[PDB]
């Protein structure tokens, strides 16, 4: 009748309604109109007696659910070991009908949500499916199910649709949704595949060679992931494989680590797979990395050893660069890597470039004569390339332990390279100091920098004197002027000649406030080329007159015979040549020897600066603790001698530092 | 794409399916297996289903829009029946 | 050609510039008068990149400004000559 | 909602003492006494 | 222009000239427009004028208002409870 509340019979709507339920179950054919009638045939029930009555429909529905579940339990039990096939047709003929029944009981629950154990008819029907699975099937089925997965090696393939429906049928029912799936299925499958890959791990390891074992297990894992994606739910993808890689690899890792020593000393794929497998292990990589470090130490040292007595720094630089290129090609090519292996390379070549033969360690000086050698004129090589070769040199410089002596040597390299016009490009030799500066910092390349600026300042200054020359009443040479602290060159200690220095020197007194200049004579030239156009070596040795012998004019003018006797050099080369000396008819180890000390005192100054810098910021330190921090600070300059820092302390306590009593070590600071 | 809604008095009401999917009962009706689309009702009169449909059109069209929301006229004698079928349609 | 003519054409020379002392490195500290002192070479703070602060003294001995300034605070006597420096 | 706002329109023309006697819907007169403002 | 209608014979809910409106009517009814006339309770609606000229006179919760053609030229209420 109308939608007015009518007391309707209890079997009239229940016969056609029940047969409609059974028609919705198994996706049987239901008519397009009776479905349009059932909602009325339920709303009419849930209203007027003159009280609601859905409590009956819920219970009766649950009864039909139970009976159907038990019927399909006897059919499923009838199936001899094919319970999962009729169970697949069961679930795939049960799910859509269950959801359609849940949509069919909308009003049954919209007036029932205000009264809720076990509401949500859909959740209750799936609860009855749970009542189908709690049966000994859950002991049988999984045992019968894993048996179709146990056929893993060469046991393929059953219907991924059927098994995927059986396993996927577990994660569907929930009001912790993965609880039933995890307890019923994930632990037995997990531990059973664990046993499977333990047994087959030992079975494979007894069979194959090392590289063949790694190849095989890699293929096995690559297949295993695809399998887990065919059968299982994604919620276990990370877990299942984590067992596999734990039993096939990392369960025998002593063996792999043992074959590593061999494999990293073969340039030959097996090592790439070695990285791949050891990486997914708790502790797989450290031994391999260690062995690559030792390998590179060996081959590297071997390269940089084959050059003895051959007096070539170029071969040493090119050799170290050769090794570095080799192993960068290696590590980037095969290891997907790296940073660890790269650091091992860096440590190894760090130990290669420092020799301890008895000298010592002969690395920085050679790396100074490589630069000095590569910057000279050599009239030869080609520029637009020298800057490339230096760009390579940046690395071999990077690895040097003592950058200290490299600096102090390159200072004299540059000094002689400038004060005698030996360089090839000012624009380039600046860019070299730019390289060293971007490698170390401002402190390292300062004396080099303004040591390079005094040539520009000296040029402009020479111009200014060229103006001041003729700028008074009445009225030929050019001078370099140097900042006198950035220049390691010494005087190496005769009266004024033709003169002309003072008529020029009054300029430098009036132009600067109080600068005191000192004249160096050790590096002063003259004018060559006798008149007879084409050797002509006459710059120093200002004597200029008989023709007279050497020991017959021992009575020279006011000058000492310290270096005079070593230069009496003009009667040796061309022009004077004791019996008879006739007129012509035509045309550094010891320096370094005593240079080895300025490095020592510069280290004393540097460590002194470290002492003050540290003792001011932090207030007090014990005698041990200040050291290792002086060390921490002066790391990249050089490894400082502990024999020096203590005496440096005992010097600074005479100036900034006080110490009271040594019961517990203690060192305070004084303003 | 288009569904029909028939009242107990005989008046048909054709409208797109999504306009009818507003009430949970009707979206449970078109969810009926068989393919099933046309729908009838043998208990709701026409003077009520017409008001229910006119109620659908508003909140299908005008919701979260930019305008001053007006009120809703309901006749003082069908309001009982409209309330009843409103309880029926779960809307 | 000629044997004894020796006409003296183009000359050259090179020289360093410093301040008006000997000096043996500004005895207050043991660094050069034209190279950074202890507090500045160690402080790693702001300073002029070529001449930090050259301080001439009216007593005709020049030192680094803040060396003889800190020493000037702790005791007014001049170190080299045991007198009052400026 | 049509149901609840029709409830609200009806409660403006029905005494609070006639929420059971109208016999509108037997699963709804239990809701006629549960919807304040 | 943005107007709802109540075209009746059947009452269909759908939503620019009169011709395109007859297309919208032709949507499910599937009949050409030359077989349809439109009347507003006393008048004849022409095709040469747009819908906006022939509005916002019909709210969406209660809008307002089809004479078909049989051969050539077009020819030829809810309940109430007690
Ligand atoms: Zn200073
Ligand atoms: Zn003095
Ligand atoms: Zn000083």
Numbering used by the authors:
A (entry chain A): 1 to 116, 135 to 193, 198 to 290, 292 to 381, 383 to 403, 405 to 500, 506 to 523, 530 to 567, ...
B (entry chain C): 17 to 51, 53, 58 to 112
C (entry chain R): 17 to 102
D (entry chain V): 157 to 193
E (entry chain B): 1 to 9, 12 to 17, 22 to 60, 64 to 74, 77 to 87, 92 to 97
Task: Give me lines lifted from the publication on this model.
Cullin RING E3 ubiquitin ligases (CRLs) constitute the major subfamily of E3 ligases that catalyze the transfer of ubiquitin from the E2-conjugating enzyme to the target substrate. The Cullin protein is the core of CRLs, acting as a scaffold that brings together the substrate and the E2-conjugating enzyme. Our work focuses on the CRL2VHL ligase, a complex containing Cul2 as the scaffold protein and the von Hippel-Lindau protein (pVHL) as the substrate receptor.
Here, we present the first crystal structure of the CRL2VHL complex to 3.9 Å resolution, revealing for the first time the full-length Cul2 interacting with Rbx1, which provides insights to the mechanism of the E3 ligase activity. In parallel, we prepared the same complex in the presence of an HIF-1α 19-mer peptide (residues 559–577) bound to pVHL, mimicking one of the natural substrates of the CRL2VHL ubiquitin ligase. Calculation of the Matthews coefficient retrieved a solvent percentage of 63.9%, consistent with the presence of one protomer per asymmetric unit (ASU) arranged in a C2221 space group. The full-length Cul2 binding Rbx1 at the C-terminal domain and the VHL-box-EloBC at the N-terminal domain constitute our final model. Nevertheless, for the remaining residues (54–156) that constitute the substrate-binding domain and the 19-mer HIF-1α peptide, no electron density was observed. In Cul2 the globular domain is considerably moved toward the NTD relative to the other Cullins. In summary, these observations highlight a trapped closed state conformation for non-neddylated full-length Cul2 and support the previously reported flexibility of the Cullin scaffold, which is thought to contribute to an allosteric mechanism of polyubiquitination of substrates. Firstly, the N-terminal loop of Cul2 assumes a critical role in the interaction, with Leu3 inserting into an hydrophobic pocket on EloC, defined by Met105 and Phe109, and Pro5 being involved in a three-way contact with Val181 in pVHL and Met105 in EloC.
